[PDB]
C-alpha cells in the first residue's frame, strides 16, 4: 500500500466515473467519483512531498466539485419533474 498504488487505483476509478458521467449514468458516476476520491485521499495521506500533496489535493477538489455538480443536477432534475 503506497501512494503510487493508491493513485493508480484512484485514477482508474475516476476514469470509470468520468465514463459513466459522459454516458449520462449520473447516479452511478456520483458513486464512482467518491470511490475515486477515497483512493486520492489515501494517496494524499501517504505522500510526504508538499508539492505533490497539493497536486493531488487540487485534483481531488476537481473531482469532488464534479461529483457534487452531478448530485445537485440529479436532485434538481427530480424536483423539477416531481
Amino acid at each position: 500500500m503506497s501512494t503510487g498504488d493508491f493513485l493508480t487505483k484512484g485514477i482508474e476509478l475516476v476514469q470509470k466515473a468520468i465514463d459513466l458521467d459522459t454516458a449520462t449514468q449520473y447516479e452511478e458516476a456520483y458513486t464512482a467519483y467518491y470511490n475515486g476520491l477515497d483512493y486520492l485521499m489515501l494517496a494524499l495521506k501517504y505522500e510526504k512531498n508538499p508539492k505533490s500533496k497539493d497536486l493531488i489535493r487540487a485534483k481531488f477538489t476537481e473531482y469532488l466539485n464534479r461529483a457534487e455538480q452531478l448530485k445537485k443536477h440529479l436532485e434538481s432534475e427530480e424536483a423539477n419533474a416531481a
Partner: peptide, 21 residues
Amino acid sequence: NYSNTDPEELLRKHVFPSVPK
C-alpha cells in the same frame, strides 16, 4: 509506506483525467 514523490515525476507516471465540461 510513505513516499516523497517529486511532482514532475508524479505527473509523468500519473496523468489525471479531466471531468466532462
